[PDB]
Amino acid sequence: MQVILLDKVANLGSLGDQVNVKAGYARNFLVPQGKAVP
C-alpha cells in the first residue's frame, strides 16, 4: 500500500514522502493515528 507520510516515522521516511508499507501497517496504525494518508 502506497502512503504519504504526514510525520517522521522511524525506518521509513519524513513528512511528504511516498513509501510502500504493508496494508496492515497503514490500515491499523499509520492512517488511524494520523501519521500518514493514502
Partner: protein
C-alpha cells in the same frame, strides 16, 4: 447471516468431488471478519462484517465512498 456488507458475498453451494468423481453437496463460505474501520470524516470507528476482498475494496475506494454505497442500499452500520 454470513454476508459481506461491502461486496454482498454470501455462501454459495457446490460439490466436493472425489477421485472417483462422487459428488457431495458442500458450501463455499466467504472469508468474513468483523473489522473496526477508522472513519476520519466522522472521527470514529465503524464496525463492518466484511470479506477480506471487501477490505481490499475499502483500501482502494476508501471507507467514505464505501459507506455511501451502504447508505444507498439501505444497509445499517
Amino acid at each position: 447471516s454470513r454476508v459481506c456488507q461491502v461486496t454482498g458475498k454470501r455462501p454459495v453451494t457446490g460439490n466436493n468431488r472425489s477421485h472417483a468423481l462422487n459428488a457431495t453437496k458442500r458450501r463455499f463460505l466467504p472469508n468474513l471478519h468483523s473489522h473496526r474501520f477508522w472513519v476520519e470524516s466522522e472521527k470514529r470507528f465503524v464496525t463492518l462484517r466484511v470479506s477480506a476482498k471487501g477490505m481490499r475494496v475499502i483500501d482502494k475506494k476508501g471507507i467514505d465512498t464505501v459507506l455511501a454505497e451502504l447508505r444507498a442500499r439501505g444497509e445499517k452500520y
